[PDB]
Design a protein around this nucleic acid. Structure first.
Lengths: 114, 101, 155, 95, 98, 206, 79, 127
RNA sequence: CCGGCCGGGAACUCAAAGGAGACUGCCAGUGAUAAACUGGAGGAAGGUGGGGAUGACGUCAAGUCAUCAUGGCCCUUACGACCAGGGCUACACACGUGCUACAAUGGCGCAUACAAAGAGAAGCGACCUCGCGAGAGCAAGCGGACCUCAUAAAGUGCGUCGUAGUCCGGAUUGGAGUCUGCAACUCGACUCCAUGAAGUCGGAAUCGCUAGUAAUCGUGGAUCAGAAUGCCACGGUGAAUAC
RNA sequence: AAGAACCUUACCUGGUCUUGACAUCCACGGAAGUUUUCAGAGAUGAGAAUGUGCCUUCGGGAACCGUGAGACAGGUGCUGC
């Protein structure tokens, strides 16, 4: 019960507990586990270390917690250093995809100042 | 409604009819999946810019044919939402009457 | 309303038991107009009432209802430049309908896991008179009997 | 109390905005507690006209006053609103 | 075998129009399968009624385009020229099939 | 500014349509502005011919323009050469064909367009408006009309503020739908602005 | 994000590149085509993209070939 | 022989056909229990037939289209009541007393302009 | 080949034309023997059946000179005209209308039952192949009770989640894609993978609704190359309450 | 506003134009139209080829395209008090 650095979800089901890794949702976890041949509705307390070892090398191809946290930072380091439009929205805490900023803009700002 | 702009788009309907719907093969015949993915397909994107810009059918605002109003249009009658009512109540549009259900 | 003593219409009864009283009860917790989802919860909640009380099913329901139905109701009455809580005696067709509304609002809180057992626990506790539905009835009567000083009728 | 000052053909300055809020601080405490204000200033070729819509705990009350130089218009508007606020207050006391 | 399908805007005009056809179809020739009524289209147009604001001020119009079918069984040559040159009461529109 | 158009609400009950052609959604648009462009053209020169209304039918690649007018002699002129003179230039607008007919009206004082243009021609040649509306309603009631209402609005004699005047006579019941009420409107382009006159004329209820 | 077949560049800029790369480094290219992509043929030249009222000079570095010309030309000025 | 009543309710038309036999009922080549046998208002089909006797007396074959699950089922209740035409007002006079023969003509209202769902006004508020 | 599939049938559903019907018409009682009222019978419908259309004289010198028409004034090598690029999408903030929620009357996976209304020719676009998917290729059919959009969804059957910011929530952002169009950087929609924010039922205050209504569920249309949580329509389920 | 990427769009920076983008009238040429090159952000500007009927009064009668003169055209400029 130790996958890709922490991964300690006890008595959760198989495809559900694997999504605790930063780097996998429910689609990849049912794709990762089908590549190793384990039934997807079984709790990981049932799984033995002779079955957990097939999970460790399968999750090593899709990038996870260690480097996935920094590859998405490599892009935002690149855009803020170049000075594009999305870089300055990243540089000022504003929305990037062209959403409304007159009224809401609020999950990007955070709280409200006054 | 700004008589020049009524005269501006009557230029655009003439230009869009003569170049495109005659030279529409530049997009729909060569610029697709083909056994022609060489530089001839690359010229298909490029020579469209030498064409005048006011020749695409997607620059028609489709204004009213009595006042030239760009907003409130109806494709069935070809008039704006004002001139449809004042002709329907007069009795100019055949079949049209007030609806109730 | 000002005019119009309203022409009352009828309710079709319950399929499983020959009662419109429980068919009135299933229409109350029928949220967003979903009757099959409403009727499945109440049938699962009264079969649970039988094993947890020993009796038969439908007459165990009203013995939890006579322990929760009120006899007097207090109102706000506007007189003078203020407004006090005058008590009034309840009509019987409102008396049961005020009772089974108090059951459901106690069943949406008192949070247990499923809705069928949330209703099934206090339908027992209405009969043993320690649930929070009876505490609504006794605190209504606690306010009406404190306000016995307001009334031109003596019954 | 939240002010909402708005002008139709009268672009509000900074001296005029504080002149509204200091005047609307008067008809504040001294008459009633209120929720929300909408102030509208208008110039119609002669009449400096000022409207105001107060929202209170009971309902709404509106007053309008045309004046001389947009300062006497708001000075007549508050006296129109303060009398409607005392009439509404004693309607909700009835001792 | 002619699927003579005809539409109009007025129901009182389209009923006199098909009755002008089915009587000539039995005066010469025979085998008429009636003026069967087909479902009419009811194109509704909701139009704003002011030159400006008040969205909620609107006016609803409609066009009821009535539709009738005759569907003769076996063609005779005396009627196939008689169905042409008889298209009076303007407001109706005929479309023949074979 | 709050009433329904009394001609347009009763269009299947008593009043007929001024256009009686069928077209599906492909040619419905270009039929209608060509119907409009011959309506703006025939009102141009035949304004002195006292035209009431223009009924247009389009049978099978043609057009039939029946002109309702008060003076049928001057619209054809001598010999009838001018009704074929428009017939060359009607065909010039719409598709070829064209058979222009004239169905004259016997009473120019009971048709709502022919009352509304007689006032609006008087208001532009500077007469008193109270003379015009009172002469209009007393001429209609002496000829068989069971009701008339004439309402004029505008500057009304050069006053700097506008007002309305109306001089109804008889029964003009607008809310009943079986009542045949002829209604039309014209405009006076005087030296003070636009003066609008709208005439209701009630004849019968079936 | 879009234009699955072929990147887009305008002819009044594309031919203005191949008359300005073989002839040495030249003037800041006063262009209005913000709609055009950065190709690798213009790496190391000065481009003057129009932002609405002036022409901001941008030096085309090696790593901006995935973007367009208008993304390095801000339009609205805030504070 | 075979008797007919039409029956319809809430944009859903039934076609019921009765004749004497056993107590089977078949709806669009399906029985009741595979169509809505304990679904929403399960007994609304049989409830005009416990006002009378039905135990193994009349078998029937119906075809219903349009509407929904309870809209079809109310059309059958009006339908088989209309089908009891060979059994006249000895059976029908005490059938008016509990309903079952009124059309229940409550249709859905048209959505009006300005409103949202024919009564709902779009919430003009003060706060 | 049990598919209205095929002969056939014209009964039925339905289509849309023409009629019938509901009028306090009938009975009983009260009332000034009047108008009328309350109740009952019959009846599909009973007291203007249900809904729409219909807006009295006027009111606010309300809205519109930017639909249009128009009096007066003003511009007329510019307040006119053309073109590219930008802006109308800016954001410390304030407010109004909506959508999605905070879950177990649910989420998810599989199986599966029943609608109405409407649109379609530079249009709707089957079936068959390819792609995880948005879609792509080939391409019939259809100016349409025929063909296409077009699986209705909630519901129901089974299984799982165990009350946790959770298998709730779908925001934000990164990567990779599709379609439209000359061109989706400013500034489109959608799909895929990943990321999983606030949010645990909401202060003072406030809103809509009297029955097929409220509340929920999906569908369609106009505008339109593309671009609705809006608007206009359509049906499914379906209340509580009115002293 | 029943739907702002360009267009729409009326606003802004910049490139331009003038009896004009749109209408009638006068005078003078050219059938209109079609294909293509260069410069330019495009508008525009310089071109290169092609093209010719309807009535004979025939410098035409029309259609359409250029040049000049004004009468003017144009305005989503102001006042809905």
């Amino acid at each position: 019960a130790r996958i890709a650095g922490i991964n300690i979800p006890d008595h959760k089901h198989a495809v559900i507990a694997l999504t605790s890794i930063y780097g996998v949702g429910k689609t990849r976890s049912k794709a990762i586990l089908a590549a190793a041949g384990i039934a997807e509705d079984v709790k990981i307390s049932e799984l033995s270390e002779g079955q957990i070892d097939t999970l460790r090398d399968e999750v090593a191809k899709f990038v996870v917690e260690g480097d996935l946290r920094r590859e998405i930072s490599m892009s935002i380091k690149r855009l803020m250093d170049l000075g594009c439009y999305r870089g300055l929205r990243h540089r000022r805490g504003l929305p990037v995809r062209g959403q409304r900023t007159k009224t809401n803009a609020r999950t990007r700002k955070g709280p409200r100042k006054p | 409604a700004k008589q020049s702009m009524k005269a501006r788009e009557v230029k655009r309907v003439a230009l869009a009819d003569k170049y495109f719907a005659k030279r529409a093969e530049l997009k729909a015949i060569i610029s697709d999946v083909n056994a022609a993915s060489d530089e001839d397909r690359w010229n298909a994107v490029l020579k469209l810019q030498t064409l005048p810009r006011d020749s695409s059918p997607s620059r028609q605002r489709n204004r009213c044919r009595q006042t030239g109003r760009p907003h409130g249009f109806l494709r069935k009658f070809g008039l704006s939402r004002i001139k449809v009512r004042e002709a329907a109540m007069r009795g100019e549009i055949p079949g049209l009457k007030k609806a109730s259900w | 309303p000002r005019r119009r003593v309203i022409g009352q219409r009828k309710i079709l009864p319950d399929p499983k038991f020959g009662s419109e009283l429980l068919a009135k009860f299933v229409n109350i917790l029928m949220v967003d107009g979903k009757k099959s989802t409403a009727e499945s919860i109440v049938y699962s909640a009264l079969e649970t009432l039988a094993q947890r009380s020993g009796k038969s099913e439908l007459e165990a329901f009203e013995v939890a209802l006579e322990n929760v139905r009120p006899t007097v109701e207090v109102k706000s009455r506007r007189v003078g430049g203020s407004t006090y809580q005058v008590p009034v005696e309840v009509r019987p067709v409102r008396r049961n309908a005020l009772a089974m509304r108090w059951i459901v609002e106690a069943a949406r809180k008192r949070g247990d896991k499923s809705m069928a057992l949330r209703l099934a626990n206090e339908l027992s506790d209405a009969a043993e008179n320690k649930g929070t539905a009876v505490k609504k009835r006794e605190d209504v009567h606690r306010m009406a009997e404190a306000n016995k000083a307001f009334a031109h009728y003596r019954w | 109390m939240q002010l909402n000052i708005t002008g139709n053909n009268v672009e509000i300055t900074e001296a005029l905005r504080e002149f509204v809020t200091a005047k609307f601080a008067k008809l504040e405490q001294y008459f009633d507690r209120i929720n929300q204000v909408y102030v509208v200033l208008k110039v119609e070729k002669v009449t400096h006209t000022s409207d105001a819509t107060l929202h209170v705990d009971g309902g709404e009350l509106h007053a309008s006053a045309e004046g001389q130089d947009m300062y006497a218009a708001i000075d007549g508007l508050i006296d129109k609103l303060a009398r409607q606020l005392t009439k509404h207050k004693d309607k909700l006391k009835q001792h | 075998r002619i699927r003579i399908r005809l539409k109009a805007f007025d129901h009182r005009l389209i009923d006199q129009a098909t009755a002008e056809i089915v009587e000539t179809a039995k005066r010469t020739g025979a085998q008429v399968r009636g003026p069967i009524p087909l479902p009419t289209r009811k194109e509704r147009f909701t139009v704003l009624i002011s030159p400006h604001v008040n969205k909620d001020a609107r006016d609803q119009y409609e066009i009821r385009t009535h539709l009738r079918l005759v569907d003769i069984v076996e063609p005779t040559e005396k009627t196939v020229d008689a169905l042409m040159r008889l298209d009076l009461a303007a407001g109706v529109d005929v479309q023949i099939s074979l | 500014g709050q009433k329904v158009h009394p001609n347009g609400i009763r269009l299947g009950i008593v009043k007929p349509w001024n256009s009686t052609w069928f077209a599906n959604t492909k040619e419905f648009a270009d039929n209608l502005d060509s119907d409009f462009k011959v309506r703006q053209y025939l009102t141009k020169e035949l304004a002195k011919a006292s035209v009431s209304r223009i009924v247009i039918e389009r049978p099978a690649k043609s057009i039939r323009v029946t002109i309702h007018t008060a003076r049928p002699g001057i619209v054809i002129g001598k010999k009838g050469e001018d009704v074929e003179k428009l017939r060359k230039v009607v065909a010039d607008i719409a598709g070829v064909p064209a058979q222009i007919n004239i169905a004259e009206v016997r009473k120019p004082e009971l048709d709502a367009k022919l009352v509304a243009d007689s006032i609006t021609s008087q208001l532009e040649r500077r007469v008193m408006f109270r003379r015009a509306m009172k002469r209009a309603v007393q001429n209609a009631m002496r000829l068989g009309a069971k009701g008339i209402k004439v309402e004029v609005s505008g500057r009304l004699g050069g006053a700097e503020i506008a007002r309305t005047e109306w001089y109804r006579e008889g029964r003009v019941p607008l809310h009943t739908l079986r009542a045949d009420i002829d209604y039309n409107t014209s405009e006076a382009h005087t030296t003070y602005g636009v003066i609008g006159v709208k005439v209701w004329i009630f004849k019968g209820e079936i | 994000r879009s234009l699955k077949k072929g990147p887009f560049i305008d002819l009044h800029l594309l031919k203005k590149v191949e008359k300005a790369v073989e002839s040495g480094d030249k003037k800041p290219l006063r262009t209005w085509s913000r709609r055009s992509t950065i190709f690798p043929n213009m790496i190391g030249l000065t481009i003057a993209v129009h932002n609405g009222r002036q022409h901001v000079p941008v030096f085309v570095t090696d790593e901006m070939v995935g973007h367009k010309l208008g993304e390095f030309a801000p339009t609205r000025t805030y504070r | 022989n075979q008797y007919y009543g039409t029956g319809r309710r809430k944009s859903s038309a039934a076609r019921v056909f009765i004749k004497p036999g056993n107590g089977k009922i078949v709806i669009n080549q399906r029985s009741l229990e595979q169509y809505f046998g304990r679904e929403t208002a399960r007994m609304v089909v049989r409830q005009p037939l416990e006002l009378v006797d039905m135990v193994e007396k009349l078998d029937l074959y119906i075809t219903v289209k349009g509407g929904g699950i309870s809209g079809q089922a109310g059309a059958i209740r009006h339908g088989i009541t209309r089908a009891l035409m060979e059994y006249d007002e000895s059976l029908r006079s005490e059938l008016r007393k509990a309903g079952f023969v009124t059309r229940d003509a409550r249709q859905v209202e048209r959505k009006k302009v300005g409103l949202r769902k024919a009564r709902r006004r779009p919430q003009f508020s003060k706060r």
